[PDB]
């Protein structure tokens, strides 16, 4: 037995405003006792539909729902930001309850060119021992993106990892930090530490530093 | 709609777990408390329910017989329990509530269980301060280093939540060290950093820490 939800597509890609529909196949006849939902980047989970087409009364009109035979389909007419996020189907005519594989939502928007900005270590932390230099591509698109790291001029290789957020709810665009570990010691000897990004929206590389000596500021 | 689920917990292996999942609201009424898994990452697997009403429970083959539900009709609270607990149990669990006007008509937050032989340790905040290497037109950046903390989850959030536009909390990282780091980022205006006070606030619940850090210039 088992009843398998069989969801379509597994990733999907569109334009803001667009209408987009996702689809979910019942090997066996579940009645229209199909349920529909999203999971948000932070984990909410939220009824969207149930009983195939019956809207949540508190989800928007975008949001609709559909049956033709053994196919479900949920449909979001014009796509916002705020939509971006992993969405499943799951049947609940009978038991064991199944959820489809699910389908992740991207976003595609126009160009943006990320605003770069660069932390020296705080003093606390250096109180500490360590020293994390931290670099930040701010609100970009596309994903893209290449960080490289120079200390006195000198490339470095091994010591930083970079993390990327989920596209942005307000406007679908990325953030990246690219951190820059070191032991104080070690950041204590060099002086300059520089930030080189290169992304489609920059004409040229940008290249952020700051002087340890001069502290954050201008001192 | 909002479920209440208790919170995140660091387990060591061999060892059992128990969750609960109430309602905001004394509710009442015929209801049914459906669970779910989710592995970081992965999709959803339903566990299986309790019915408060008579008692009755019903599991996925998947568990072995590894999860039991229970209720307790004064307070409207469900529980799963899962024993001998393997890294295989490490994921985010979630409680529904169908049957009464609905099909699965509110969930739960989700709860974070960590199955390992590491042992807690509350995180180090560092501020990422505002300065003119991060300041562009009228506006700049600032933010919290979330250093050396475990397991997941940390949560943060600014001013007490009063600022979420531009907020920009990434994913945590697993160091070499076995702990994990992350940082969270805001734009504020250039100009309010003289007057405004801008203060993370962080928690990991795990290990019972809470820290809010004022970020000056």
């Known amino acids: 037995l088992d009843i398998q939800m069989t969801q379509s597509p597994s990733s999907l890609s569109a334009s803001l405003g667009e209408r987009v529909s996702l689809t979910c196949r019942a090997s066996?006849?579940?009645?229209?006792?199909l349920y529909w939902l999203q999971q948000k980047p932070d984990g909410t989970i939220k009824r969207l539909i149930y009983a195939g087409s019956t809207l949540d009364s508190g989800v928007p009109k975008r949001f609709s729902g559909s049956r033709s035979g053994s196919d479900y389909s949920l449909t979001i007419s014009s796509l916002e930001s705020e939509d971006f996020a992993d969405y499943y189907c799951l049947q609940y005519a009978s038991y064991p309850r199944t959820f489809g594989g699910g389908t992740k939502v991207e976003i595609k928007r126009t160009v943006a060119a990320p605003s770069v900005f660069i932390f020296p270590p705080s003093d606390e932390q250096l109180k500490s021992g360590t020293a994390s230099v931290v670099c930040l591509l701010n609100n970009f698109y596309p994903r893209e993106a290449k960080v490289q790291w120079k200390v006195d001029n000198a490339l470095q290789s091994g010591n930083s990892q970079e993390s990327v957020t989920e596209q942005d709810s307000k406007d679908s665009t990325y953030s990246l930090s690219s951190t820059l570990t070191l032991s104080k010691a070690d950041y204590e000897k060099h002086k300059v530490y520089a930030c080189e990004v290169t992304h489609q929206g920059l004409s040229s590389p940008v290249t952020k530093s700051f002087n340890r000596g001069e502290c954050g500021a201008g001192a | 709609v909002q479920l209440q689920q208790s919170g995140p917990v660091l387990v060591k292996p061999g060892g059992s777990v128990k969750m609960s999942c109430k309602a905001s609201?004394?509710?009442?009424?015929?209801?049914?408390f459906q669970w779910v898994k989710q592995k970081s990452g992965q999709g959803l697997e339903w566990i299986g329910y309790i019915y408060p009403y008579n008692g009755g429970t019903r599991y996925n083959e998947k568990f072995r017989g590894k999860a039991t539900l229970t209720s307790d009709k004064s307070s409207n609270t469900a529980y799963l329990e899962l024993s001998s607990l393997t890294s295989e149990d490490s994921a985010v669990y979630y409680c529904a509530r169908s049957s009464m006007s609905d099909p699965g008509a509110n969930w739960g937050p989700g709860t974070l269980v960590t199955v390992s032989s590491a042992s807690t340790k509350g995180p180090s905040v560092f501020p990422l301060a505002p300065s003119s290497k991060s300041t562009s037109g009228g506006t700049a950046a600032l933010g919290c280093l979330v250093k050396d903390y475990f397991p997941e989850p940390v949560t943060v959030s600014w001013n007490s939540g009063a600022l979420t536009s531009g907020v920009h909390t990434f994913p945590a990282v697993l160091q070499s060290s076995g702990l994990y780091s992350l940082s969270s980022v805001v734009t504020v205006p250039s100009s309010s950093l003289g007057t405004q006070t801008y203060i993370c606030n962080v928690n990991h619940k795990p290990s019972n820490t809470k820290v809010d850090k004022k970020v000056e210039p």
């Open positions: 066996q006849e579940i009645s229209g006792y």
């Open positions: 609201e004394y509710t009442l009424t015929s209801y049914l």
